Amino acid sequence: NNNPQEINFTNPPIQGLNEGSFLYWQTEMPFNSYNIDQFITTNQSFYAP
């Protein structure tokens, strides 16, 4: 609320992930989802042994 009108930040908090975005922050995320790891054989086998 710096200015008298409130300003909402769009980019700063990420609320989604795609292939390139995952590749950019691969080792900086706190969790991994199955929706992207299902396309790798070893990762999928680890998810569903």
Q: Give residues in contact with other proteins (CB under 8 A).
A: 2-3, 7-12, 14, 18-21, 24-25, 27-30, 35-36, 39
CB of 35 to other proteins, least distance (A): 6
CB of 37 to other proteins, least distance (A): 9
**Cα gap 4→33, rounded to integer Å:** 40
Q: CA 23, 12, 21 angle in degrees (round to 5)?
A: 15
* 32 closest CA partner among 43, 41, 48: 43
CB of 42 to other proteins, least distance (A): 15
